[PDB]
Amino acid sequence: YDIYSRLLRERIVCVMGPIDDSVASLVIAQLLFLQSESNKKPIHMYINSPGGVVTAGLAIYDTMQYILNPICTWCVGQAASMGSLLLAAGTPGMRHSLPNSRIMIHQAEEIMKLKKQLYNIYAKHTKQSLQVIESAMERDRYMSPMEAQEFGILDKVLVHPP
Amino acid sequence: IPIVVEQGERAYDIYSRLLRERIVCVMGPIDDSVASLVIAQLLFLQSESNKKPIHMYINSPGGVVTAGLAIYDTMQYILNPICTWCVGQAASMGSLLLAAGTPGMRHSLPNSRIMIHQAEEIMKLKKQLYNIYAKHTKQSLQVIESAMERDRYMSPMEAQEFGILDKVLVHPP
Amino acid sequence: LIPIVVEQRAYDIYSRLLRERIVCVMGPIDDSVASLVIAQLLFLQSESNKKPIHMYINSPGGVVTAGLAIYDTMQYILNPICTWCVGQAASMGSLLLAAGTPGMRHSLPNSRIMIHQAEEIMKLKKQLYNIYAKHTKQSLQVIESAMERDRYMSPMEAQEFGILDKVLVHPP
Amino acid sequence: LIPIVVEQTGERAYDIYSRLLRERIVCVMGPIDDSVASLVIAQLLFLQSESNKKPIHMYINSPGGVVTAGLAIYDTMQYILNPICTWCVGQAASMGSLLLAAGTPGMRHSLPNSRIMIHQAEEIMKLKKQLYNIYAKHTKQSLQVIESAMERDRYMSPMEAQEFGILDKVLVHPP
Amino acid sequence: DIYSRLLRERIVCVMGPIDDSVASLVIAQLLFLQSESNKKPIHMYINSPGGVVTAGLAIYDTMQYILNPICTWCVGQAASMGSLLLAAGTPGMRHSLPNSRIMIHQAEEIMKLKKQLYNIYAKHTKQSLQVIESAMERDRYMSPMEAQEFGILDKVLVHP
Amino acid sequence: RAYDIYSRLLRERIVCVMGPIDDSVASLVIAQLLFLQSESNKKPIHMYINSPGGVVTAGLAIYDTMQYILNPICTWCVGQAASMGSLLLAAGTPGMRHSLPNSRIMIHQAEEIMKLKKQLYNIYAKHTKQSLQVIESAMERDRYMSPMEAQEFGILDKVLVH
Amino acid sequence: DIYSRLLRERIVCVMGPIDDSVASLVIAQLLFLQSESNKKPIHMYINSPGGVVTAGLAIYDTMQYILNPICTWCVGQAASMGSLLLAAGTPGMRHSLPNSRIMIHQAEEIMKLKKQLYNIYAKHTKQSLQVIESAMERDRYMSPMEAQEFGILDKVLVHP
Rounded (10°) angle between helices B121-136 and B65-77:
40
Contacts with E68 (C-beta within 8 Å, 6 or more apart), sequence order = E33, E34, E37, E38, E39, E40, E41, E42
Phi, psi of B22 (to 5 degrees): 60, 30
Q: Is the Cβ–Cβ distance between F30 and G75 less than 8 Å?
A: yes
| Residue burial F56-89, b: 16+ Cβ < 10 Å; e: rest | bbbbbbbbbbbbbbebebbbbbbbbbbbbbbbbb
Beta bridge partner(s), residue D14: D5
CA quadruple F90, F92, F97, F100: dihedral sign: negative
Q: What is the largest CA-CA distance in chain C?
A: 57
B173 at A interface, C-beta within 8 A: no
Architecture of domain A3-157: Alpha-Beta Complex (3.90)
Q: Is the Cβ–Cβ distance between E159 and E125 less than 8 Å?
A: no
- The span from the CA of F22 to the CA of B7, in Å, is 47
- The span from the CA of E107 to the CA of B16, in Å, is 47
Label the pairing between strands F73-82 and F45-51.
parallel
- The span from the CA of F131 to the CA of F35, in Å, is 35
Terminal Cα distance for chain F, rounded: 32
Rounded (10°) angle between helices F2-10 and F23-39:
20
- The span from the CA of G33 to the CA of G56, in Å, is 19
- E-assigned strands of G80-117? 94-96, 101-103
Of the candidates G106, G102, G87, the one whose C-alpha atom is nearest the C-alpha of residue G141 is: G102
The answer to whether the CB atoms of E62 and A50 lie below 8 A apart is no
Q: Is D94 left (phi over 0), alpha (psi -120 to 50) or beta?
A: left
Helix (H, G, I), strand (E, B) or coil at E97: coil
The answer to whether the CB atoms of E58 and A50 lie below 8 A apart is no
**Is CATH 3.30.1330.120 correct for D22-117+156-170?**
no
Q: Is D33 left (phi over 0), alpha (psi -120 to 50) or beta?
A: beta
Of the candidates C119, C149, C143, the one whose C-alpha atom is nearest the C-alpha of residue C131 is: C143
E17 at G interface, C-beta within 8 A: no
C169 at D interface, C-beta within 8 A: no
Which residues of D are catalytically annotated?
94, 119
The answer to whether the CB atoms of F78 and D41 lie below 8 A apart is yes
Residue of B nearest to C86 (CA): B70
What residues of D are in contact with residue F25 (Cβ under 8 Å)? Answer: none
Nearest to D16 among C9, C43, C72 (CB): C43
| HSE-up of residue F99 (Cα within 13 Å, Cβ side) | 30
D39 at F interface, C-beta within 8 A: yes
Name the resolution in angstroms.
3.4
Distances from the Cα of G95 to the Cα of B47, E6, F63, angstroms: 62, 29, 17
B14 at C interface, C-beta within 8 A: no
What residues of C are in contact with residue B79 (Cβ under 8 Å)? Answer: 171
Count, in order, helices (H) and strands (E) of chain B. Answer: 7, 9
B117 at A interface, C-beta within 8 A: no
Rounded (10°) angle between helices D95-102 and D122-139:
40
The answer to whether the CB atoms of C11 and D12 lie below 8 A apart is no
Over its C-alpha atoms, chain G yields an Rg (Å, rounded) of 15
- The span from the CA of E71 to the CA of E91, in Å, is 9
Label the pairing between strands F73-82 and F97-99.
parallel
Nearest to E28 among A7, A99, A160 (CB): A7
CB atoms within 10 A of CB D173: 8
Helix (H, G, I), strand (E, B) or coil at E73: strand
**Is CATH 1.10.420.10 correct for G3-156?**
no
Nearest to F160 among D38, D46, D79 (CB): D79
The answer to whether the CB atoms of G77 and F70 lie below 8 A apart is no
- The span from the CA of A103 to the CA of A87, in Å, is 9
What residues of C are in contact with residue D11 (Cβ under 8 Å)? Answer: 7-8
Q: What is the DSSP code (8-state) at residue G10?
A: T
Label the pairing between strands D4-8 and D11-15.
antiparallel
State the nearest Cα–Cα gap between D78 and chain F, in angstroms. Answer: 7
Of the candidates G74, G69, G72, the one whose C-alpha atom is nearest the C-alpha of residue G33 is: G69
Over its C-alpha atoms, chain C yields an Rg (Å, rounded) of 16
State the nearest Cα–Cα gap between A63 and chain B, in angstroms. Answer: 8
The answer to whether the CB atoms of E159 and G64 lie below 8 A apart is yes
Label the pairing between strands C81-90 and C53-59.
parallel
CB atoms within 10 A of CB B1: 14
- The span from the CA of G77 to the CA of F61, in Å, is 8
F45 at G interface, C-beta within 8 A: no
DSSP F17-44: EESSB-HHHHHHHHHHHHHHHHH-SSS-
H-state helical runs in E2-107: 2-7, 20-36, 53-65, 81-87
* SS3 assignment for C7-28: CCCCCCHHHHHHCCCEEEEECC
Phi, psi of F79 (to 5 degrees): 75, -105
Distances from the Cα of D2 to the Cα of A36, C96, D12, D14, angstroms: 33, 21, 16, 10
Beta bridge partner(s), residue C57: C25, C85
CA quadruple F140, F143, F144, F145: dihedral sign: negative
Please give the CATH superfamily to which domain B18-168 belongs.
2-enoyl-CoA Hydratase; Chain A, domain 1 (3.90.226.10)
- The span from the CA of B45 to the CA of B80, in Å, is 9
Q: Is the Cβ–Cβ distance between G153 and G94 less than 8 Å?
A: yes
Residues 47-106 of A with CB under 8 A from B: 55-56, 58-59, 61-63, 65-66, 68
Of the candidates D43, D69, D77, G7, the one whose C-alpha atom is nearest the C-alpha of residue F12 is: D43
CA quadruple G93, G97, G99, G104: dihedral sign: negative
CB atoms within 10 A of CB G115: 11
**Is CATH 3.20.20.70 correct for E2-104+141-155?**
no
CA quadruple A141, A146, A152, A154: dihedral sign: positive
CB atoms within 10 A of CB G134: 8
What residues of B are in contact with residue C14 (Cβ under 8 Å)? Answer: 40
Nearest to A59 among B59, B152, B169 (CB): B59
- The span from the CA of E141 to the CA of E47, in Å, is 14
The answer to whether the CB atoms of E47 and G58 lie below 8 A apart is yes
What residues of C are in contact with residue D25 (Cβ under 8 Å)? Answer: 42
Over its C-alpha atoms, chain D yields an Rg (Å, rounded) of 17
The answer to whether the CB atoms of A66 and B172 lie below 8 A apart is yes
Q: What is the DSSP code (8-state) at residue D105?
A: T
DSSP C81-128: EEEEEEEEEETHHHHHHHTSPTT-EEE-TT-EEE-----HHHHHHHHH
- The span from the CA of B24 to the CA of B40, in Å, is 11
Helix (H) or strand (E) holding C141: helix C140-146
Helix (H, G, I), strand (E, B) or coil at D136: helix
Of the candidates B58, B28, B59, B23, the one whose C-alpha atom is nearest the C-alpha of residue B42 is: B23
H-state helical runs in chain F: 2-10, 23-39, 56-68, 84-90, 111-128, 132-139, 147-153
CB atoms within 10 A of CB E150: 18
Q: Is the Cβ–Cβ distance between B85 and B57 less than 8 Å?
A: yes
Which residues of G are catalytically annotated?
80, 105
CB atoms within 10 A of CB B103: 12
Contacts with B81 (C-beta within 8 Å, 6 or more apart), sequence order = B53, B54, B102, B105
Count, in order, helices (H) and strands (E) of chain G. Answer: 7, 6
The answer to whether the CB atoms of B32 and C26 lie below 8 A apart is yes
Nearest to E21 among A1, A17, A99 (CB): A17
- The span from the CA of E122 to the CA of D41, in Å, is 70
Of the candidates F119, B99, A35, the one whose C-alpha atom is nearest the C-alpha of residue G99 is: F119
Phi, psi of D55 (to 5 degrees): -60, 155
CB pairs under 8 A between D and F: 66
Of the candidates F89, F103, F97, the one whose C-alpha atom is nearest the C-alpha of residue F59 is: F89
Our answer on whether D and F touch (3+ beta-carbon pairs < 8 Å) is yes
Q: What is the DSSP code (8-state) at residue F92?
A: S
Distances from the Cα of A62 to the Cα of A21, A26, A56, B114, G7, angstroms: 14, 14, 10, 15, 47
In the PDB record, what is the listed experimental method?
Answer: cryo-EM
Q: Is the Cβ–Cβ distance between F54 and F77 less than 8 Å?
A: no
Contacts with F67 (C-beta within 8 Å, 6 or more apart), sequence order = F91, G97, G158, G159
Give the total residue count for chain F. Answer: 162
Of the candidates G54, G57, G55, the one whose C-alpha atom is nearest the C-alpha of residue G65 is: G57
Residues 125-154 of G with CB under 8 A from E: none
Label the pairing between strands C105-107 and C166-167.
parallel
- The span from the CA of F28 to the CA of G13, in Å, is 10
DSSP C52-88: -EEEEEEES-B-HHHHHHHHHHHHHS-SPEEEEEEEE
Q: Is the Cβ–Cβ distance between C41 and C101 less than 8 Å?
A: no
CA quadruple C117, C120, C126, C128: dihedral sign: negative
Q: Is E34 exposed, middle or buried (0-12, 13-18, 19+ CB in 10 A)?
A: middle
Class of domain F2-108+144-159: alpha beta
| Residue burial E83-112, b: 16+ Cβ < 10 Å; e: rest | bbbbbbbeeebbbbbebbbbbbeeeeeeee
Q: Tell me how far the alpha carbon of residue C100 is from its chain's centroid.
A: 7
Domain ranges of chain E: 2-104+141-155
What residues of E are in contact with residue G28 (Cβ under 8 Å)? Answer: 2-3, 6, 13, 15
Which residues of F are catalytically annotated?
83, 108
Q: Is the Cβ–Cβ distance between B76 and C169 less than 8 Å?
A: yes
Helix (H, G, I), strand (E, B) or coil at B49: coil
Q: Is the Cβ–Cβ distance between C17 and B43 less than 8 Å?
A: yes
Angle at F102 between CA D45 and CA F58, to 5 degrees: 80
- The span from the CA of G88 to the CA of B60, in Å, is 59
| HSE-up of residue B119 (Cα within 13 Å, Cβ side) | 6
The answer to whether the CB atoms of G6 and F112 lie below 8 A apart is no
Contacts with F133 (C-beta within 8 Å, 6 or more apart), sequence order = none
Of the candidates B155, G98, G117, A65, the one whose C-alpha atom is nearest the C-alpha of residue E99 is: G117
- The span from the CA of D31 to the CA of D39, in Å, is 13
Of the candidates C49, C52, C60, C53, the one whose C-alpha atom is nearest the C-alpha of residue C26 is: C60
| HSE-up of residue A80 (Cα within 13 Å, Cβ side) | 13
Of the candidates D66, B109, F16, D165, the one whose C-alpha atom is nearest the C-alpha of residue A121 is: B109
Phi, psi of D169 (to 5 degrees): -145, 145
The answer to whether the CB atoms of E65 and A1 lie below 8 A apart is no
C27 at B interface, C-beta within 8 A: yes
Helix (H) or strand (E) holding E150: helix E144-150
Phi, psi of E51 (to 5 degrees): 175, 170
Give the total residue count for chain C. Answer: 172
DSSP G126-139: T--HHHHHHHSSS-
What residues of F are in contact with residue G139 (Cβ under 8 Å)? Answer: none
Active site residue C116: yes
Q: Is the Cβ–Cβ distance between D132 and D148 less than 8 Å?
A: no
Nearest to B109 among A21, A25, A66 (CB): A66
What residues of D are in contact with residue C14 (Cβ under 8 Å)? Answer: 1, 3
Angle at E40 between CA E54 and CA E120, to 5 degrees: 30
Q: Is the Cβ–Cβ distance between E78 and E138 less than 8 Å?
A: no
Q: Is the Cβ–Cβ distance between A50 and E20 less than 8 Å?
A: yes
Query: Which residue in E10, E99, E155, E157 has the most chain G C-beta atoms within 10 A of its own C-beta, making it the best mutation to test that interface?
Result: E99
DSSP chain A: --HHHHHHTTTEEEEES-B-HHHHHHHHHHHHHHHHH-SSS-EEEEEEES-B-HHHHHHHHHHHHHS-S-EEEEEEEEE-HHHHHHHHTSPTT-EEE-TT-EE-----HHHHHHHHHHHHHHHHHH---HHHHHHHTTS---B-HHHHHHHTS-SEE-SS--
Neighbour subunits, C (≥3 Cβ pairs < 8 A)? B, D
Neighbour subunits, B (≥3 Cβ pairs < 8 A)? A, C
Distances from the Cα of G143 to the Cα of F113, G1, G74, G98, G103, angstroms: 13, 33, 12, 8, 9
What residues of B are in contact with residue A22 (Cβ under 8 Å)? Answer: 27-28
**Is CATH 3.90.226.10 correct for C13-114+152-167?**
yes
What residues of C are in contact with residue D5 (Cβ under 8 Å)? Answer: 15, 18-19, 43
Q: Is the Cβ–Cβ distance between G150 and G135 less than 8 Å?
A: yes
- The span from the CA of G16 to the CA of F28, in Å, is 10
State the nearest Cα–Cα gap between E118 and chain A, in angstroms. Answer: 15
CA quadruple F52, F58, F61, F64: dihedral sign: positive
CB atoms within 10 A of CB A46: 22
Q: Is the Cβ–Cβ distance between B61 and B26 less than 8 Å?
A: no
- The span from the CA of C162 to the CA of C53, in Å, is 21
Nearest to E6 among G32, G57, G60 (CB): G32
CB atoms within 10 A of CB D128: 13
CA quadruple D34, D36, D37, D41: dihedral sign: positive
What residues of G are in contact with residue E44 (Cβ under 8 Å)? Answer: none
